[PDB]
């Protein structure tokens, strides 16, 4: 998918998690976030096209998605156990992780 579409999947699905009142909604949203994160992890963000795959930035980019997917999977396991509000709480850190680890690599150039 387009990098923008994957980015917007992580943004818009957090709202679907926050407003949910049943487990199904939370898992559906977490499952879309997971697929978006794994797809974006395969991409080369535009500011990194000059860089080798073994550069610290590329490794930093790829592994920031590993942090995000790990946290998505923790929330997802709670939702599969029917713990909606625990899953919703655990999903709040996803925005922090997204800003701290991924955002900077989407700046233009």
């Amino acid at each position: 998918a387009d990098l923008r579409s994957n980015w917007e999947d992580l943004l818009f699905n957090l709202a679907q998690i926050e407003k949910a009142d049943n487990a199904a909604q939370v898992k559906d949203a977490l499952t879309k976030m997971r697929a978006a994160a794994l797809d974006a992890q395969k991409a080369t963000p535009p500011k990194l096209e000059d860089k080798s795959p073994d550069s610290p930035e590329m490794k930093d980019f790829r592994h920031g998605f590993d942090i995000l997917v790990g946290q998505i999977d923790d929330a997802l396991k709670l939702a599969n156990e029917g713990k909606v509000k625990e899953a919703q709480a655990a999903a709040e850190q996803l925005k922090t992780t997204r800003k701290a680890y991924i955002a900077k690599y989407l700046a233009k150039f």
Partner: antibody
Amino acid sequence: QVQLVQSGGGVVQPGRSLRLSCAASGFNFGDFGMHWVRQAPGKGLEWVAVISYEGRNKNHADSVRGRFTISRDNSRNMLYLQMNSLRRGDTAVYYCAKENRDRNYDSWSASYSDYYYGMDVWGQGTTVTVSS
Amino acid sequence: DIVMTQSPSFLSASVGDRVTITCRASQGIDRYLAWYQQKPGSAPKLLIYAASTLQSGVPSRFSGSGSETDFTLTISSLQPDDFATYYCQQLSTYPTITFGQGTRLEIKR
């Protein structure tokens, strides 16, 4: 000229439905998120809905969720608001509005450039009156 | 959802006055706050975004500031064109957006 021209609206009875349209011109419509905002008689602005540049992601306010559905057709530069199960409390002028991009950015740069910087271009407004 | 509270709701001023309008967020929103102007019978007009950035074409006498949860809009010296209603808008919770309730600025006599 960057502009949004709205059509539709009018008097509609409770529990029935209506579709608002918003025709865009003078810019790359499919590069921007789009919003609906409403204003009841004598009251403030109330945010209604947003849709992503592609039409794949959307969100609606608690007060309209499950009854209103935002959508778009990029090949015709059209934005829509489908309103079902109308209630008298939905009486308002409805505005469509284009998401603003921060001026230091010519193209999409995720949260540096989009989403968080208001709405720069507004339609002229469509009146909806819900009454029996 | 986040509540934006504008103060005062109504205020009077004369041409040439310095005018300050405040908005207060129920929780932190960093700088993701925009200000709008609306006159009766017309659409809102974006004045300021990111709390302090002046939208192009907006006269330089408008200015904004604030962080986290306290924000103000200032008009250094009023013109007749500035009597209107002003709304703040938080976008930190995007794609959930909320507006302040508005502040009407009227001519004193």
